[PDB]
């Protein structure tokens, strides 16, 4: 069965919109789950003794919009009070209430599809024995799929995927590759090189396909405790070419960080 809402009801009986249907619609538009909120203090809450007065705060919890207009919440002294919005749809006249609790007791209850009381923490209010010392809001989470954006400003951090690979390149050379965002690679050299000539392909393992660059990458390395250096070429085909001077039977410790991009302009 298909239940339609944002459509013409010719007889004003067909597609009435329920509060839970708008709740789900709003949750979907903003990308919120039952474990977060949308919250805005239009005016600052006021702290008086062991109380927080929400002067004009709007909240969206489980896609349900409500306003706190001079609504006071009594607090526990010398405590971290977790302020919750509680939604009980069976309390038809007053479905929303606020509580100050000892822990974040957000329960993720699906009030739009099932029974139960939704509890969602939106504020953290710390008190002394006499009043409020600090207030910190709960993070408003946006769960999104694919974003097309022109410009972005990040005040915190972006967490991108990370892949690692250790290559025993041969001749005693070891590469430890870290790839981030599937593009930027930082190669850390380890081991000690011996029995190699300039221009020669190293005798060991070739770089795995996911770490291979589109174009040849020359990575500069250094010989530990010396004023001498080398470079290796990571070829698009996966092979590694030695471009330092010829090395004899005695291995010299190889170290250093080199970076490259896997992707070119495309």
């Amino acid at each position: 069965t298909i239940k339609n809402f944002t459509f013409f009801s010719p007889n004003s009986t067909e597609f009435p919109v329920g509060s839970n249907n708008d709740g789900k619609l709003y949750m979907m538009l903003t990308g919120m789950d039952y474990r977060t909120i949308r919250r805005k203090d239009w005016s600052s809450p006021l702290n008086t003794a062991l109380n927080v007065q929400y002067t004009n705060t709007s909240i969206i919890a489980g896609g349900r919009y409500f306003e706190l207009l001079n609504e006071t919440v009594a607090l526990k002294g010398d405590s971290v009070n977790y302020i919750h919005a509680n939604i009980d749809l069976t309390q038809t006249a007053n479905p929303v209430s606020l509580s100050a609790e000892t822990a974040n007791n957000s329960n993720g209850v699906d009030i739009n599809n099932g029974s139960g009381v939704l509890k969602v923490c939106f504020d953290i209010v710390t008190t002394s024995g006499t009043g409020v010392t600090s207030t910190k809001p709960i993070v408003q989470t946006s769960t999104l799929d694919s974003i097309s954006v022109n410009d972005m400003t990040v005040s915190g951090s972006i967490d991108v995927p990370v892949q690692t690979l250790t290559v025993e390149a041969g001749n005693g050379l070891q590469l430890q590759l870290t790839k981030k965002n599937n593009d930027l690679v930082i190669v850390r050299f380890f081991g000690s090189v011996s029995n190699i000539q300039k221009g020669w392909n190293m005798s060991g393992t070739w770089v795995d396909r996911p770490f291979r660059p589109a174009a040849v990458q020359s990575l500069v390395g250094h010989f530990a405790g010396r004023d001498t250096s080398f470079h290796i070429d990571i070829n698009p085909n996966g092979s590694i070419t030695w471009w330092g001077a010829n090395i004899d039977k005695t291995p010299i410790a190889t170290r250093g960080n080199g970076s490259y991009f896997i992707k070119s302009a495309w």
Partner: nanobody, 122 residues
Framework: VQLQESGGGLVQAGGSLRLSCTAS????????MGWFRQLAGKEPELVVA????????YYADSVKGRFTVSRDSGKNTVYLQMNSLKPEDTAIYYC????????????????WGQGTQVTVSS
């Protein structure tokens, strides 16, 4: 990855001869073009090679200062100018080409030729 093996035949000991090789395509970076030598039914071995991208040559100690490898424009053609020839040098010279620098291993070569026979008369 096809190969052409122009030049090669009969000449006297202490004389001079040449070898030509052209590859259809290049498999990637660190493009090395050269020749593998096979004397008296023994195992084939790389003797002369040129790193195209680096303009760096490799010659085995046994042929040093006697042989000279050259490149023709951007035609991906390699020439071996063999002067002061020896009877030991009588071998079957196959043309080898690869991406990834110089290597002793046969399998690592993307292009392998038919093989032109060198006969140094006495």
């Amino acid at each position: 990855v096809q190969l052409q093996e122009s030049g090669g035949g009969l000449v006297q000991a202490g004389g001079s001869l040449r070898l030509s090789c052209t590859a259809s395509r290049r498999t990637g970076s660190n493009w090395c073009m050269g020749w593998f030598r096979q004397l008296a039914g023994k195992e084939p071995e790389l003797v002369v090679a040129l790193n195209f991208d680096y303009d760096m040559t490799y010659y085995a100690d046994s042929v040093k200062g006697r042989f000279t490898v050259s490149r023709d424009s951007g035609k991906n053609t390699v020439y071996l100018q063999m002067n002061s020839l020896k009877p030991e040098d009588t071998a079957i010279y196959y043309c080898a080409a690869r991406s990834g620098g110089f290597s002793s291993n046969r399998e690592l070569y993307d292009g392998w030729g038919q093989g032109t026979q060198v006969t140094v008369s006495s």
